[PDB]
Design a protein around this motif. Structure first.
Motif, mmCIF file in Angstrom:
data_model
loop_
_atom_site.group_PDB
_atom_site.id
_atom_site.type_symbol
_atom_site.label_atom_id
_atom_site.label_comp_id
_atom_site.label_asym_id
_atom_site.label_seq_id
_atom_site.Cartn_x
_atom_site.Cartn_y
_atom_site.Cartn_z
ATOM 1 N N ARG A 190 45.471 36.212 46.085
ATOM 2 C CA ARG A 190 45.545 37.373 45.206
ATOM 3 C C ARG A 190 46.346 38.549 45.783
ATOM 4 N NH1 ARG A 190 39.084 38.774 45.824
ATOM 5 N NH2 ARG A 190 39.233 39.962 47.781
ATOM 6 N N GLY A 193 50.391 39.178 44.506
ATOM 7 C CA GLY A 193 50.666 39.998 43.339
ATOM 8 C C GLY A 193 50.716 41.485 43.657
ATOM 9 N N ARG A 209 52.704 38.819 33.095
ATOM 10 C CA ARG A 209 51.336 38.417 33.416
ATOM 11 C C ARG A 209 50.870 37.059 32.887
ATOM 12 N NH1 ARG A 209 48.931 43.255 35.068
ATOM 13 N NH2 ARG A 209 46.768 42.542 34.751
ATOM 14 N N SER A 210 51.550 36.542 31.872
ATOM 15 C CA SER A 210 51.135 35.287 31.247
ATOM 16 C C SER A 210 51.498 34.001 31.967
ATOM 17 C CB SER A 210 51.695 35.212 29.828
ATOM 18 O OG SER A 210 51.222 36.290 29.043
ATOM 19 N N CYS A 212 52.221 32.265 35.939
ATOM 20 C CA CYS A 212 51.991 32.462 37.373
ATOM 21 C C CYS A 212 52.541 31.336 38.240
ATOM 22 C CB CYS A 212 50.490 32.551 37.649
ATOM 23 S SG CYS A 212 49.562 33.703 36.607
ATOM 24 N N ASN A 225 46.318 28.980 41.262
ATOM 25 C CA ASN A 225 47.034 29.765 40.273
ATOM 26 C C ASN A 225 47.437 30.984 41.107
ATOM 27 O OD1 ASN A 225 47.720 30.470 37.405
ATOM 28 N ND2 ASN A 225 46.464 32.261 37.936
ATOM 29 N N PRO A 227 49.012 34.609 40.480
ATOM 30 C CA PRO A 227 49.504 35.719 39.658
ATOM 31 C C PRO A 227 50.488 36.565 40.443
ATOM 32 C CG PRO A 227 47.169 35.459 39.391
ATOM 33 C CD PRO A 227 47.547 34.679 40.610
ATOM 34 N N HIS A 228 51.459 37.160 39.758
ATOM 35 C CA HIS A 228 52.445 37.980 40.448
ATOM 36 C C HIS A 228 52.199 39.482 40.282
ATOM 37 C CE1 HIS A 228 54.615 34.183 40.798
ATOM 38 N NE2 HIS A 228 54.599 34.072 39.484
ATOM 39 N N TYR A 229 51.128 39.841 39.573
ATOM 40 C CA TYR A 229 50.795 41.252 39.348
ATOM 41 C C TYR A 229 49.637 41.722 40.225
ATOM 42 C CZ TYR A 229 47.442 38.836 36.343
ATOM 43 O OH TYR A 229 46.458 37.987 35.889
ATOM 44 N N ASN A 232 44.714 41.114 40.750
ATOM 45 C CA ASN A 232 44.402 39.914 39.985
ATOM 46 C C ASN A 232 43.194 39.226 40.624
ATOM 47 O OD1 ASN A 232 45.285 37.555 41.842
ATOM 48 N ND2 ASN A 232 47.059 38.934 41.914
ATOM 49 N N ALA A 234 42.893 35.937 41.524
ATOM 50 C CA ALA A 234 43.263 34.640 42.064
ATOM 51 C C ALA A 234 42.209 34.180 43.066
ATOM 52 C CB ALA A 234 44.635 34.726 42.741
#
Ligand SMILES: CC(C)(C)OC(=O)Nc1cccnc1C(=O)Nc1nccs1
Ligand SMILES: [Ca+2]
Ligand SMILES: [Co+2]
Ligand SMILES: [Co+2]
Ligand SMILES: [Co+2]
Length: 304
Positions: A190, A193, A209-210, A212, A225, A227-229, A232, A234
């Motif tokens: 996490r 992101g 956001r949709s 990853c 998974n 996420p790049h934001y 998150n 994760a």
């Protein structure tokens, strides 16, 4: 359907391209709906595979071949060339390397790679549109060889582009590398992101956001998974032996996305441009090996 920008799909699409039977195929290749039973069996699980020495060699090989194929696509980027032509070259390049083009029939995706122009965030379907000077275009490549998938992507400039395009692409690449530089055993998935969004935000850009990053090995998309934001949820901590991708999609405007009627093409809801870069990474005892890195050139194509 109301298009969000100037891009429109250019039909008809050529009939699906066959892959010679001598090339080993992933389970979904022959499923009527392109479903992957091996992948679905692990849907909802957060446990991350610890690759064996054998798995690692398989990943090193397919990722090197995938880079070779992306380099082939890179050499074809120029005004006037259609994305279907790029796809045809990619398809043949995969075959030449005794690899199956992973995107082909994955949940019925119709082509062998994804070509995402301007406002297309990802999963653009190669079609009859000729690239236009000033466009930015991402080609996402994934190959399957001996049971392993290798995945990478780069955004390219078509002819001369404006300063905004240059800044968006450079920033996106920097976001990816700052995240990769943070990869090592003990780091939470996490955290990546937080790093990516910090850099994108500092440059006035947003983070999709949709979609990853994802674990990849015997499966195309699996745990973790990534996420790049920022901030998150994760699940997981990096350990030597983990293999996954980081593939931030950064936008000039808002982060909101929507999908075209084709069920695949993801575009910014405001019609502004988006750029992406991706590498497949292997976590080692001390940091990470960039499996899809260029071995013969210091920089990505857009700065080469
Ligand atoms: C829900 C399921 C089937 C496991 O697929 C995914 O998560 N998929 C995914 C996640 C993140 C980024 N990308 C994809 C994806 O498919 N991308 C594709 N590329 C080419 C054909 S399908
Ligand atoms: Ca794009
Ligand atoms: Co994808
Ligand atoms: Co990819
Ligand atoms: Co990927």
């Amino acid at each position: 359907y109301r298009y969000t920008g100037k891009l429109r799909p250019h039909y008809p699409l050529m009939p699906t391209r066959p892959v010679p039977s001598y090339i080993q195929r992933p389970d979904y290749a022959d499923h009527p709906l392109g479903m992957s039973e091996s992948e679905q069996a692990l849907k909802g699980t957060s446990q991350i595979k610890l690759l064996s020495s054998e798995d690692i060699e398989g990943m090193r090989l397919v990722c090197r071949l995938a880079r070779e194929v992306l380099d082939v696509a890179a050499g074809m980027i120029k005004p006037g060339v259609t994305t279907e032509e790029i796809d045809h070259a990619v398809h043949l390049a995969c075959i030449a390397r005794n690899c199956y083009p992973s995107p082909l029939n994955y949940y019925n995706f119709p082509k062998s790679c994804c070509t995402s122009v301007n406002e297309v965030i990802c999963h653009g379907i190669p079609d009859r549109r000729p690239l236009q000077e000033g466009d930015i275009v991402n080609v996402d490549i994934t190959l399957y060889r001996n049971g392993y998938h290798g995945d990478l992507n780069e955004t390219f400039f078509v002819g001369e582009v404006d300063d905004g395009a240059r800044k968006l692409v450079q920033t996106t690449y920097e976001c990816l590398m700052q995240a990769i530089d943070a990869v090592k055993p003990g780091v939470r998935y996490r955290e990546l992101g937080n790093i990516i969004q910090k850099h994108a935000q500092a440059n006035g850009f947003s983070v999709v956001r949709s979609y990853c990053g994802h674990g990849i090995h015997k499966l195309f998309h699996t745990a973790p998974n990534v996420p790049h934001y920022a901030k998150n949820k994760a699940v997981g901590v990096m350990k030597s032996g983990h293999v996954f991708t980081i593939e931030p999609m950064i936008c000039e405007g808002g982060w909101q996305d929507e999908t075209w009627p084709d069920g695949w093409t993801a575009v910014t809801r405001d019609g502004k441009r988006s750029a992406q870069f991706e590498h497949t990474l292997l976590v080692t005892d001390t940091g990470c090996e960039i499996l899809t890195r260029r071995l013969d050139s210091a920089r990505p194509h857009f700065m080469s």
